[PDB]
């Protein structure tokens, strides 16, 4: 029988988009989806709704919170430092969420962040905490062994995995320092960041993650053993095709370059670089001599790309490089045959989009636990990309380190480049295997049915 599932993702494009990809896959199997979205953002989401008769959007008014910029609805609307205020606004949607659940009466609600399970169990609805970040990240920072240390968890503590963690990788000093401090910072309604997610993990009926057994399996197993409740896998949430073909302006421009010759660089929809690293990144791309398309916000303190470019940059790169601030159809750009290299901030959505395509991956994780852990897994475990080197204590890169990583992967005679290409091909063949995503969804839907039994 078909399930009625409500979707309540965090107010961020990197959560809304894969939640909607998954919504489409579930609607193809006959399930009815009630998709909760901030009101103005719904217009930008319609392009991803392939089953409008089964997936219905329900708008949420993002409430005012002192400090939240007027009209803001997603993390793409606010500086990263204002994310906690947007979380307070999510928390404050509780009244309109309660109303929606009582009228719509879904069997299950998928959610982020809102530690909701008390309301749903009052209403006889099953709560499902559904992550689109890596379960390796949650396992590393939010498993019970980490939370019982409370404020005694130091940077030295975070240089080791928690007890029982299933794999090994290394963090740099500045990364463990970042994890140790930001963990304690309030993220919405006075709740420390890791406490919030741990409360969600503890109070929800079941947990799910984007991913497959072959890659995410050890982490989901560890989390199931630690929290003693089902931790499901949805499959890798392969991107669905959009109803909008590639913008002719980009299609024309990309089509002027030889196959596999262009370096595409994008650091997602949320973050802004500081000027000095913006300069180092752009000079590093220029040094390679390959054509490039860099999708970047103007750096901190600047309002236009033009004002922040290194001196003489436009004049030198001419028509071979574009640095662009606006939202583009990244999934369609990565499919274009001109693209030979993807310099990625290692957001989990961008990683999936890179892996299912042919571009060589250069890993430039920004300062966020999931980006860093995705980068270590991709660079050291799957070995599908080359990571740009950062200073151990300062977390900064040089233009020469960007140049070096791109040069390695784009050099047909470089054996590291050939290696990461071969490994990437193996991972793409896995993720696109004719029965991989379907058998993940088969198991996923069987366990959701068990949950509502
Ligand atoms: O990046 C992490 C992350 O997601 C991001 O969190 C950012 C906070 O600044 C932004 O909000 C951003 O948009 C969002 O994607 C979540 C998270 C997601 C969904 C949940 O339901 C939830 O409970 C937790 O947990 C983490 C836990 C870590 O220890 C380290 C991490 O790096 C993350
Ligand atoms: O200009 C842009 C920026 C991002 N994306 C998409 O937005 C999502 C970003 O998710 P990810 O986890 O990679 O990064 P975030 O933006 O959340 O840091 C992915 O599906 C990207 O394809 C896009 O289409 N155009």
CATH code (residue 163): 3.40.50.2000
Domain that holds residue 272: 248-431
Name residue 263's beta-bridge partners: 292, 341
Q: Are residues 264 and 228 in the same domain?
A: no
User: Is residue 355 lining ligand 2, measured as CB closer than 6 Å?
Assistant: no
Q: What is the resolution of this structure in A?
A: 1.7
| Residue closest by Cα to atom 1 of ligand 2 | 327
Rounded Cα gap, residues 159 and 387, in angstroms: 19
Q: Are residues 313 and 341 in the same domain?
A: yes
Number of domains in the chain: 2
Q: Are residues 173 and 303 in the same domain?
A: no
H, E, C per residue of 238-262: CCCCCCCCCCHHHHHHHHCCCCCCE
| Residue closest by Cα to atom 31 of ligand 1 | 369
Cβ atoms within 10 Å, residue 383? 17
User: Is residue 205 lining ligand 1, measured as CB closer than 6 Å?
Assistant: no
Q: Are residues 326 and 445 in the same domain?
A: no
Q: Are residues 74 and 219 in the same domain?
A: yes
Q: 5: exposed, middle or buried (C-beta count within 10 Å: 0-12, 13-18, 19+)?
A: buried
Name residue 128's beta-bridge partners: 110, 206
- Please name the helix (run of DSSP H) or strand (run of DSSP E) that holds residue 18, with its range, or none: helix 13-28
Task: Give SS3 for 329.
Answer: coil
What separation, in Å, do the N-terminal and C-terminal C-alpha atoms of the chain show? Answer: 12
Is 112 assigned a catalytic role? yes
Q: What is the dihedral of CA 395, 396, 402, 408, to 10 degrees?
A: -40
Instruction: Please enumerate in sequence order all residues whose Cβ is within 8 A of that of 348, keeping only pairs 6 or more positions apart, or say none.
Output: 14, 18, 132, 133, 134, 210, 370, 374
User: Is residue 140 lining ligand 1, measured as CB closer than 6 Å?
Assistant: no
Residue 243 located in a structural domain = no
Q: Give the technique used to solve this structure.
A: X-ray
């Amino acid at each position: 029988s078909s399930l009625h599932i409500a979707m309540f993702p965090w107010f961020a494009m990197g959560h809304l988009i894969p939640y909607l990809h998954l919504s489409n896959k579930l609607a193809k199997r006959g399930h009815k989806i009630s998709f909760f979205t901030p009101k103005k953002t719904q217009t930008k989401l319609e392009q991803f709704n392939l089953y409008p008769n089964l997936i219905t959007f329900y708008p949420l008014n993002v409430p005012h919170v002192d400090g939240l910029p007027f009209g803001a609805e997603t993390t793409s609307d606010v500086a990263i430092s204002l994310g906690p205020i947007l979380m307070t606004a999510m928390d404050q949607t509780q009244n309109q969420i309660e109303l929606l659940l009582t009228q719509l009466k879904p069997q299950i609600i998928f959610f982020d962040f809102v530690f909701l399970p008390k309301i749903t169990q009052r209403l006889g609805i099953k709560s499902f905490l559904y992550f689109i970040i890596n379960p390796a990240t949650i396992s590393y920072t939010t498993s019970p062994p980490r939370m019982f240390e409370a404020e005694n968890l130091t940077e030295v503590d975070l240089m080791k995995p928690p007890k029982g963690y299933p794999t090994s990788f290394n963090l740099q000093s500045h990364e463990a320092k970042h994890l140790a401090s930001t963990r304690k910072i309030e993220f919405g309604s006075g709740i420390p960041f890791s406490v919030r997610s741990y409360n969600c993990l503890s109070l929800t009926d079941a947990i799910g993650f984007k991913g497959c057994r072959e890659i995410e399996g050890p982490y989901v197993d560890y989390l199931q053993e630690q929290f003693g409740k089902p931790v499901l896998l949805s499959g890798p949430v392969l991107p669905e095709q959009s109803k909008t073909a590639l913008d002719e302006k980009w299609g024309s421009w990309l089509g002027g370059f030889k196959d596999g010759s262009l370096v595409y660089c994008a650091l997602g929809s949320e973050l802004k670089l500081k000027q000095d690293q913006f300069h180092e990144l752009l000079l590093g791309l220029e040094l390679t001599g390959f054509p490039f398309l860099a999708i970047l916000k103007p750096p901190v303190g600047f309002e236009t790309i033009e004002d922040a470019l290194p001196e003489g940059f436009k004049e030198r790169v001419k028509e071979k490089g574009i640095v662009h601030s606006g939202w583009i159809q990244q999934q369609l750009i990565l499919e274009h045959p001109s693209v030979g290299c993807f310099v990625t901030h290692c957001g989990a959505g961008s990683i999936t989009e890179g892996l299912v395509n042919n571009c060589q991956m250069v890993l430039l994780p920004q300062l966020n636990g999931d980006y860093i852990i995705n980068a270590r897994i991709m660079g050291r475990h799957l070995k599908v990309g080359v990571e740009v080197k950062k200073g151990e204590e300062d977390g900064l890169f040089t233009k020469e380190s960007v140049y070096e990583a791109v040069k390695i992967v784009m050099d047909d005679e470089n054996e590291i480049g050939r290696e990461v290409r071969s490994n990437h091909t193996k991972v793409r063949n896995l993720l696109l295997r004719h029965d991989l995503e379907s058998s993940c969804l088969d198991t996923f839907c069987e366990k959701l049915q068990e949950l509502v039994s």
